[PDB]
Design an enzyme around this catalytic site. Structure first.
Site, PDB file in Angstrom:
ATOM      1  N   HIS A 151       0.764  -1.197  -0.194  1.00 36.51           N
ATOM      2  CA  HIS A 151       0.072   0.002  -0.021  1.00 36.51           C
ATOM      3  C   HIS A 151       0.959   1.352  -0.064  1.00 36.51           C
ATOM      4  O   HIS A 151       0.375   2.376  -0.141  1.00 36.51           O
ATOM      5  CB  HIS A 151      -0.690   0.063   1.309  1.00 36.51           C
ATOM      6  N   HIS A 195      -6.624  -7.623   0.990  1.00 35.36           N
ATOM      7  CA  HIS A 195      -6.478  -6.399   0.366  1.00 35.36           C
ATOM      8  C   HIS A 195      -6.139  -6.070  -1.066  1.00 35.36           C
ATOM      9  O   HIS A 195      -5.144  -6.945  -1.175  1.00 35.36           O
ATOM     10  CB  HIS A 195      -5.777  -5.246   1.551  1.00 35.36           C
ATOM     11  N   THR A 220       1.959   1.243 -17.681  1.00 30.26           N
ATOM     12  CA  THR A 220       2.800   0.482 -18.323  1.00 30.26           C
ATOM     13  C   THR A 220       2.407  -0.949 -18.696  1.00 30.26           C
ATOM     14  O   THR A 220       1.849  -1.654 -17.707  1.00 30.26           O
ATOM     15  CB  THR A 220       4.304   0.501 -17.772  1.00 30.26           C
ATOM     16  N   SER A 223      -4.616  -8.931  -8.480  1.00 33.42           N
ATOM     17  CA  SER A 223      -4.972  -8.978  -7.482  1.00 33.42           C
ATOM     18  C   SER A 223      -6.344  -9.381  -7.045  1.00 33.42           C
ATOM     19  O   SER A 223      -7.264  -9.216  -7.671  1.00 33.42           O
ATOM     20  CB  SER A 223      -5.032  -7.390  -6.835  1.00 33.42           C
ATOM     21  N   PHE A 224      -6.263 -10.205  -6.081  1.00 40.10           N
ATOM     22  CA  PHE A 224      -7.492 -10.797  -5.468  1.00 40.10           C
ATOM     23  C   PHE A 224      -7.938 -10.198  -4.159  1.00 40.10           C
ATOM     24  O   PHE A 224      -6.882 -10.184  -3.523  1.00 40.10           O
ATOM     25  CB  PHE A 224      -7.457 -12.533  -5.466  1.00 40.10           C
ATOM     26  N   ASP A 243      -3.453 -12.379   5.661  1.00 43.79           N
ATOM     27  CA  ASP A 243      -4.560 -11.824   6.118  1.00 43.79           C
ATOM     28  C   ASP A 243      -6.074 -12.228   5.314  1.00 43.79           C
ATOM     29  O   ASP A 243      -7.005 -12.010   5.860  1.00 43.79           O
ATOM     30  CB  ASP A 243      -4.733 -10.237   6.549  1.00 43.79           C
TER      31      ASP A 243
END
Ligand SMILES: CN(C)C(=O)[C@H]([NH3+])Cc1ccc(F)cc1
Ligand SMILES: [Ca+2]
Ligand code: NA
Ligand SMILES: [Zn+2]
Length: 368
Positions: free
Chosen positions: A135, A172, A184, A191-192, A258
């Site tokens: 993040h 997340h 790019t 991302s899942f 997580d």
């Protein structure tokens, strides 16, 4: 065949402290390490202590002003930096603690050292469980992350790899990594993640990238309570298609824990086996692979998860009966490696999972 694994760890990492009540516990990396040492996994892999990444190294992505602030701010001079703290989103979620900058240097140093190792073709896999801080943004801290080790590692890989694939199974969204590479085609981010009134609030499947990066961001938004079988239903197919269409020469896999059942901040229902199946899948493509950590707040289960995923990387079977270790009491009341799912409801229907999958497939048809 079996892969050579280089593993990065600094034993000072476990001593950094985010403050009383703060769910992020660096100590979990020490628990992880101690657990896999006690399973004997050091016999099968090379263990390195990473360098401390320099401000120079960090400004390959971050702004000079932000990195100068990170290396000056301390609990004793906070009052004088209140303005800078607000601008760079430090002092709350991302507190000031003793040794903050050194913690960033060790986190980052593992990820870049692994990427160097891979670029030199001296390992097949590199592992940095203290990394994965997806993040952190160019000029601001976010979500307990200050320096974006993943972005810096991928920039290292791009020195020798035309196409790098980033995969993120943290609950997340990988916003800082997606953001860095959004325009790019040289990095595809997949991302899942949980989506819907949930940190950080990004990763809609309609976010697909922009400019030359359009169609090189891939987002699988999920509801609460996904289980090993719903996740498994879609991960292998999406990754296979990505591999087929994108043909990366190197892979970065963020393995934030997580997304496990019973995580203090998470709302998924995966087991360690369900989680680790993702490592298994990515491993089979036989590409240079950097495996990183991430979130994870039920720390006994983080230690299980990353120990098992080390064993997966090594193709080394380990028993369910936990060996004695310095944290043995944390693994009660069962003292086993593997975990059970909860009875929480899965809000992700089979139809939902197949529909989102099919939308992502339509998008992947747009690659060259
Ligand atoms: C709670 N929250 C935002 C998260 O857990 C994210 N995954 C960010 C993050 C935290 C710690 C870490 F070590 C790596 C990444
Ligand atoms: Ca994710
Ligand atoms: Na991209
Ligand atoms: Zn997370």
């Amino acid at each position: 065949g079996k892969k050579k694994v280089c593993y990065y760890y600094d034993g000072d990492i476990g001593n950094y402290y985010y403050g009383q009540g703060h769910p992020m516990k660096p100590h979990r990396i020490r628990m992880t390490h101690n657990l896999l040492l006690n399973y004997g996994l050091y016999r099968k892999m090379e263990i390195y202590r990473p360098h401390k990444a320099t401000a120079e190294e960090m400004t390959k992505y971050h702004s000079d002003e932000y990195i100068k602030f990170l290396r000056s701010i301390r609990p004793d001079n906070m009052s004088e930096y209140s303005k800078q703290m607000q601008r760079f989103n430090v002092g709350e979620d991302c507190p000031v603690f003793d040794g903050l900058f050194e913690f960033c240097q060790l986190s980052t140093g593992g990820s870049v050292a692994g990427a160097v190792k891979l670029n030199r073709q001296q390992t097949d896999m590199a592992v940095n469980w203290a990394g994965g801080l997806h993040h952190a943004k160019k000029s601001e801290a976010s979500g307990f992350c200050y320096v974006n080790d993943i972005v810096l590692a991928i920039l290292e890989l791009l020195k020798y790899h035309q196409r790098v694939l980033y995969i993120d199974i943290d609950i997340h969204h990988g916003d800082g990594v997606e953001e860095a590479f959004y325009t790019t085609d040289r990095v595809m981010t997949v991302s899942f993640h949980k989506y819907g009134e949930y940190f950080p609030g990004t990763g809609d499947l309609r976010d697909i990238g922009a400019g030359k990066g359009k169609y090189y961001a891939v987002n699988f938004p999920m509801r609460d309570g996904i289980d090993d079988e719903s996740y498994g239903q879609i991960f292998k197919p999406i990754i296979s298609k990505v591999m087929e269409m994108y043909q990366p020469s190197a892979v970065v896999l963020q393995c934030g824990a997580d997304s496990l059942s019973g995580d203090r901040l998470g709302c998924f229902n995966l087991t360690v086996k369900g989680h680790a199946k993702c490592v298994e899948v990515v491993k089979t493509f036989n590409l240079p692979l950097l495996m990183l950590g991430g979130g994870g707040y039920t720390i006994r289960n983080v230690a299980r998860c990353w120990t098992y995923e080390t064993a997966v990387a090594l193709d080394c079977e380990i028993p369910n009966e936990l060996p004695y270790n310095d944290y043995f009491e944390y693994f009660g009341p069962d003292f086993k490696l593997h975990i059970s799912p909860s009875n929480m409801t899965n809000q992700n229907t089979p139809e939902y999972m197949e529909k989102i999958k099919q939308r992502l497939f339509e998008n992947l048809r747009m690659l060259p």
